[PDB]
Amino acid sequence: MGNRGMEDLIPLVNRLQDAFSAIGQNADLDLPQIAVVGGQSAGASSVLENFVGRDFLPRGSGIVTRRPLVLQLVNATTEYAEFLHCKGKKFTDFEEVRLEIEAETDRVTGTNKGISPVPINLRVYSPHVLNLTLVDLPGMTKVPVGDQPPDIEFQIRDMLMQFVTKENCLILAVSPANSDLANSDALKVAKEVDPQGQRTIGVITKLDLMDEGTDARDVLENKLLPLRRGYIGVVNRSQKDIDGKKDITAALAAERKFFLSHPSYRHLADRMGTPYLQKVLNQQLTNHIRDTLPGLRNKLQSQLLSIEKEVEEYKNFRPDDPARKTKALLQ
């Protein structure tokens, strides 16, 4: 468990925050939000919870991600979770969080394949995290089922747009492997909001369920559909493994064995897997935080130059100075 790529950046944020708080001002540390776009049952929730490093989201066959859960990670001194609709309660166990999320979804949408545009706001405080926004959006579908209205397709798409047309957002586009990449909706959306690939990261899931004799070797090499940041393959837990309470360590070991043994992927083994995605996102955040330094320097330099002309005289103030008095008199 855990995510150790945060540890090397947290003290940088703290030091910058302290440097600005010294003057009664904040730091414009506008880190990008992370939005996970995907088709229904593409695996977009298991990827997200593998980036956080905690097993707390509901996942599984069927329509589970019924509401647009928004997770806020706030750096703190201890570890706890809270909900805006459960104000005053404290959650010390992620299993309770998962069960409460399910109960809150059912309470509003019912037991059919319902949806609700209103998000759930879950905030987790921990000394090991950064101030991040994570958005788990409901998967897109083509036809209504259950008691959904005829426009279910358009309501879901509209829920996505308000979160991915915003600047400073990473579109983490998840598509299954045992399907044809040309028919992945997540990539159609990315091309509608990021016409040139600067933020979009491709992730290919379900590589272990490919039809025997076929592989995706020409997809992972960024040949079929060029994407500025390529595609990162991952292997998540299967439905049997979720129901079997499979450990996370075993899943990572199985993923590593899969890539090391597969005849068509050995040469890419060091470019794929869960920990590689963690490094890519952490590197993306680090590149962002460094890119803003010229603005902070220019603001501070301008303020310093503005005050210096008067500081030069204030620093020379003395309780007894007949020349200072005379200068003021003449002026």
Partner: peptide, 27 residues
């Protein structure tokens, strides 16, 4: 006037400290 002087000097030193920290953070 005394209060304005004191605030200007405090802000001056704090801004100098902020630059001395940011430059070291960038490395």
């Amino acid at each position: 006037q005394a209060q304005r002087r004191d605030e200007m000097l405090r802000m001056y030193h704090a801004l100098k400290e902020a630059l001395s920290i940011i430059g070291n953070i960038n490395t």
